[PDB]
Design a protein around this ligand. Structure first.
Ligand SMILES: NC(=O)c1nc(-c2cccc(O)c2)nc2c1[nH]c(=O)n2CCc1ccc(Cl)c(Cl)c1
Lengths: 165, 922
């Protein structure tokens, strides 16, 4: 009416096995979760570093703008003074400024590429976790069902301990 | 290496590039810059060096004006070595503070702006204003009051007793000439000051002075006898002469200076489940979204589920999910909770929660993109996760998410009704007293709950301490009932501290409840509030909104008391790496800092010390794996002796106790252990030390130690001093913290090398007449720690993790496990019993004295058992592995036997005691 099993030693043996499997699967999930957290922390660090490149590039481009507006006047002056010496220095100095920007831009690009790869890793870590979770929960439940069965059967706590530990 | 190539951007547009030394200060670098700039175009148009300030992009991606030109480039840590010359313009004070805050709190202040969030913006605007204002008031106050803010009295638990005449060393500020003279333990500090002057007058008023414990920022003042001050109490027991210095008030001033209604809308609650994004699931399976409304623990109505759409990264539903509750019924703190599942035609993927009303009480409408948090598989295994935070995941670029849309309810915007409207609706509405008495006086059942609701007015009149019970019976999914409960709550009598602590639990989410709780917590003294500071901080993780009462309360007390502010700072700072609290804590720290510009300086120094230690520790780790300890130890020392390191590790206030000055590092005395995590042992020159650990979470140890400290206080409050050693322990960062070294001590293992070694060691350290003291110190402390460890369920207790001091005091360290992690029996150790009994087989007089100490200790903790349960209940917030659930709390109920009577419990403790004594030989 009340619809909802072999010997005790054989159920107890399976309790030891399933518990070992639960502890092994738990430690695996713990490993991935350490990676999940570390990678999450690294990703924000990289994202903040990208903002730091963006901000550094911004100030360089202000320098470029400032160089254009500001130079304008002095370039005109030593033109009507055959001081093409100084014009040449100002322009060459400005060409060095532009060149350094290209190095900074390239560096920012290299990091964007790394953050893209690590973003893929984050998602892979999160995928593997989600394929481990059902094994983990199922193994927890099975372990608990075996204990309950043995406990109902009147099996002593010391015998249950040695199967779990 | 040494040199680094630095880009220089001049205000004329000119660009320079040259090597500078990494450890060179900015002032020096300006000189090198100017010297080279003269040989480059457009020089003559520049103003002098001093008319400009360098600017860099710092580690947190913010622009920073580098006003302190005595700072070294390596310490400045710019993102790239790029320095820009700009004018000394604008409110540089505001600019300087804003940049320091960002460096100090972890998170760049710009990160708050980047969110584009009114709630964030309103918090910052309102809280920074209040904190700045408090600061300005404080500056106007007198040197006495400012001293009280800055260095509040450290008094023994006697306050908030015999008489003896004992010597004190007194000198003045500037003069080497000290004076030794006798004054009584019951003399106030003003009287001792008067004596020192009368001595000076032989060779200024006594009220124009205060007394400092020289070497320390700990001061003796106020209407209290000398023996109630911790410093004197400590000296009295030790028999040492206290050394004081009298400081003039001026010297204290010097350091001071430098429309539609809600109840009308009877429409059932619904949402549009549009889409999910960035799901990482099993392609073979299908995807389901589970939803449910919540108010604290309780469901408001039944849950509802989506259709089984196939597993892809970007799933689409477009369903209406309708819930079994009307909009007019939704409580203020109504919480809509989602969980994404992967089912095979059952893995919990991720979850996310959302408040239905916003911070201004407005019922939300329109689209919403909830960036989800991944589901942790745990024992409980619930469908949804209502206890989880409401804040969205800050990893917006990579994290899975659900796009939802709250529908338009009305053409105008609708708010949750104002208090006046609540009290209007809430106004209208021998035999029975028997059933209610039984229920309260002593988890309720449906029959009982409806009685309590019926007799809710009787609860308010005759059982005011039962408020918590009455709040849990209230049906928060019916707006009529909610109004009636809130009506009572507004007239409810003030409850004691202990009750208020219960009401801060997540079971009581309503903002009026929190408000009533805090209102009862305002009678807290700073000393007592300090005992619960850690718990109060963890309760912030349960709050719905950024602007709350608890945050205001904490900032208030942090602004009035610099010790509270210190530790508030470090509790929040130590969790800034944690995504779910970084925003909330970031904002509180910002506001704290603006009201506390003096302490910011202290905390900056500490933060820099701690960042060098992290680097120092990482260098040791990489060295230890290659080379052996002696060689690594010396390499540690060389790395420490560098100017940037030495200066940053030297001359700071200790994070463990801001009154302790860590002055000169003793590099030769510094070392580490080749163990797990390679902790560093750092000594200072009154020869304090600290342990720096990086690798483990220390939060559990601090909790344990805080509870032992609370025990000590509770015992000390009823005449019992069990001579404990509750040493400082402070988490500072991501798996990082400090431990206060206890000097003149060793581990039992090391001392044990008949084995009458403990008593011999004691004999060697307390020769002749000192030994009876040492044994008594051992007895009192062994009792205290036997009970503490029994009650908290601390196992793994062995010779390595138990230490003894040269005074005779025993104490425990490294509390990795508690609350059973099975019932831990009460434990008596043969070797300790031997020492207690003065090395004799039988000493009945002494051993019974020891047994009484244990029993009295245990009896006192039972009296305050509800306090321990409540404090532990709030620590569930912290997510400590070994404090997850009701079963962990239940451990304390049983250890303290709170369902048993006082006599019954003590008779069971006796049986456990006796059986531990029997087990001692076996
Ligand atoms: N308060 C202390 O004085 C203290 N504390 C902990 C302790 C450890 C973990 C958690 C905790 O709460 C406390 N351990 C201690 C110790 N004194 C001591 O000799 N040890 C053991 C050996 C050792 C530890 C660390 C280092 Cl760096 C080194 Cl060279 C040697």
């Amino acid at each position: 009416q009340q619809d909802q099993e072999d010997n005790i030693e054989a159920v107890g043996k399976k309790l030891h096995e399933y518990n070992t499997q639960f502890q092994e699967k738990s430690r695996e999930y713990d490993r991935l979760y350490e990676d999940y957290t570390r990678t999450s922390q690294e990703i924000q660090m990289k994202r903040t570093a990208i903002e730091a490149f963006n901000e550094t590039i911004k100030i360089f481009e202000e320098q470029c703008q400032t160089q254009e507006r500001y130079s304008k006047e002095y370039i005109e002056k030593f033109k009507r003074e055959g001081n093409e010496t100084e014009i040449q220095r100002i322009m060459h100095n400005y060409e060095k400024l532009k060149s350094r920007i290209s190095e900074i831009v390239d560096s920012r690009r290299r990091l964007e590429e790394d953050l893209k790869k690590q973003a893929a890793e984050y998602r892979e870590i999160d995928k593997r976790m989600n394929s481990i979770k059902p094994d983990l929960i199922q193994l927890r439940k099975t372990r608990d069902q075996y204990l309950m069965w043995l406990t109902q059967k009147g099996v002593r706590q010391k015998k249950l301990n040695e199967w779990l530990g | 290496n040494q040199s680094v190539v630095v880009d220089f951007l001049l205000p004329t547009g000119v660009y320079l590039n040259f090597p500078v030394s990494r450890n060179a200060n900015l002032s020096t670098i300006k000189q090198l810059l100017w010297h080279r700039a003269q040989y480059e175009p457009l020089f003559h148009m520049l103003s002098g060096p001093e008319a400009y300030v360098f600017t860099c992009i710092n580690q947190t991606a913010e622009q920073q004006e580098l006003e302190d030109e005595q700072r070294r480039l390596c310490d400045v840590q710019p993102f790239l070595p790029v320095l820009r010359l700009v004018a000394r313009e604008g409110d540089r004070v505001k600019k300087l503070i804003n940049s320091q805050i960002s460096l100090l709190i972890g998170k760049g202040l710009h990160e708050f702006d980047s969110l584009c969030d009114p709630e964030v913006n309103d918090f910052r605007a309102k809280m920074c204003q209040f904190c700045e204002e408090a600061a300005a008031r404080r500056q106007q106050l007198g040197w006495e009051a400012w001293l009280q803010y800055s260095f509040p009295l450290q008094l023994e638990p006697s306050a908030q007793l015999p008489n003896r005449a004992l010597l004190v060393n007194v000198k003045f500020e500037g003069s080497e000439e000290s004076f030794t003279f006798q004054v009584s333990t019951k003399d106030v500090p003003l009287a001792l000051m008067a004596c020192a002057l009368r001595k000076k007058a032989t060779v200024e008023q006594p009220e124009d002075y205060t007394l400092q414990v020289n070497g320390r920022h700990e001061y003796l003042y106020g209407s209290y006898p000398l023996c109630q001050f911790q410093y004197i109490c400590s000296c009295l027991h030790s028999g040492l002469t206290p050394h004081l210095t009298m400081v003039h008030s001026s010297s204290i001033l010097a350091m001071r200076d430098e429309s539609v209604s809600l109840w009308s809308l009877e429409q059932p609650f619904r949402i549009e489940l549009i889409q999910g994004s960035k799901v990482n699931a099993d392609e073979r399976m299908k995807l389901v979204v589970q939803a449910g409304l919540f108010h604290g623990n309780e469901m408001l109505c039944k849950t509802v589920s989506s259709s089984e759409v196939s597993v892809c990264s970007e799933p689409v539903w477009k369903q209406r999910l309708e819930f079994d509750i009307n909009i007019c019924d939704l409580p203020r703190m109504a919480r809509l909770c989602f969980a994404l599942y992967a089912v095979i035609e059952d893995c919990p993927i991720a979850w996310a929660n959302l408040m239905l009303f916003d911070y201004k009480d407005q019922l939300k409408t329109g689209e919403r993109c909830l960036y989800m948090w991944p589901s942790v598989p745990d024992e409980k295994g619930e469908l949804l996760n209502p206890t989880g935070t409401v804040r969205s995941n800050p990893n917006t670029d990579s994290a899975a998410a659900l796009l939802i849309c709250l529908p338009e309810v009305a053409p105008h915007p609708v708010y949750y009704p104002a208090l006046e409207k609540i009290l209007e609706l809430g106004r209208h509405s021998e035999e029975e007293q028997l059933q209610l008495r039984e229920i309260l006086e002593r988890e309720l059942y449906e029959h009982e709950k409806d009685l309590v609701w019926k007799l809710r007015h009787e609860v308010q009149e005759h059982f005011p301490e039962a408020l918590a019970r009455l709040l849990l019976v209230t049906k928060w999914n019916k707006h009529e009932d909610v109004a009636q409960m809130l009506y009572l709550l507004c007239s409810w009598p003030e409850l004691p501290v202990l009750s208020a602590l219960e009401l801060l639990d997540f079971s009581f989410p309503d903002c009026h409840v929190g408000s009533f709780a805090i209102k009862s917590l305002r009678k807290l003294t700073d000393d007592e509030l300090f005992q619960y500071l850690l718990q109060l901080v963890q309760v912030l993780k349960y709050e719905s909104y950024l602007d709350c009462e608890l945050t205001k309360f904490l900032l208030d007390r942090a602004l009035a008391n610099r010790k509270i502010g210190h530790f508030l700072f470090w509790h929040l700072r130590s969790e800034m790496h944690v995504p779910s609290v970084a925003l909330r804590f970031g904002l509180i720290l910002e506001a704290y800092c603006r009201g506390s510009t003096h302490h910011m300086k202290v905390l900056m120094k500490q933060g820099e010390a701690l960042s060098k230690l992290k680097a120092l520790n990482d260098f040791v780790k990489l060295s230890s794996q290659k080379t052996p300890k002696p060689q690594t130890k010396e390499l540690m020392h060389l790395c420490m002796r560098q100017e940037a390191y030495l200066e940053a590790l030297s001359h700071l206030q200790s994070p463990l106790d801001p009154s302790t000055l860590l002055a000169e590092v003793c590099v030769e005395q510094c070392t580490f252990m080749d163990s797990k995590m390679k902790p560093l042992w750092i000594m200072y020159s009154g020869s304090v030390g600290i342990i720096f650990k990086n690798g483990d979470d220390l939060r559990q140890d601090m909790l344990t130690l805080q509870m032992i400290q609370l025990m000590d206080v509770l015992w000390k409050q009823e005449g019992l001093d069990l001579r404990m050693t509750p040493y400082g322990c402070l988490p500072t960062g991501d798996r990082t913290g400090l431990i206060e070294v206890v000097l003149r001590s060793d581990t039992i293992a090391n001392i044990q090398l008949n084995k009458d070694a403990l008593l011999n060691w004691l004999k060697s350290k307390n020769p002749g007449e000192a030994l009876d003291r040492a044994i008594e110190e051992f007895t009192l402390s062994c009792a205290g720690y036997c009970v503490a460890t029994y009650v908290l369920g601390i196992g793994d207790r062995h010779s390595d993790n138990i230490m003894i001091r040269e005074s005779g005091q025993l104490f425990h360290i490294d509390f990795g496990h508690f609350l059973g992690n099975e019932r831990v029996p009460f434990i008596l150790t043969y070797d300790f019993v031997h020492v207690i009994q003065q090395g004799k087989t039988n000493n009945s007089e002494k051993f019974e004295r020891f047994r009484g100490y244990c029993e009295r200790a245990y009896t006192i903790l039972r009296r305050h058992g509800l306090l321990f349960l409540h404090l532990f209940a709030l620590m569930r917030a912290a997510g400590l592995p070994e404090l997850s659930c009701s079963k962990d709390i239940q451990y304390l109920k049983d250890s303290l036997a709170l369902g048993k009577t006082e006599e019954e419990a003590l008779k069971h403790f006796r049986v456990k005691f006796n059986e531990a004594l029997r087990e001692s030989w076996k």
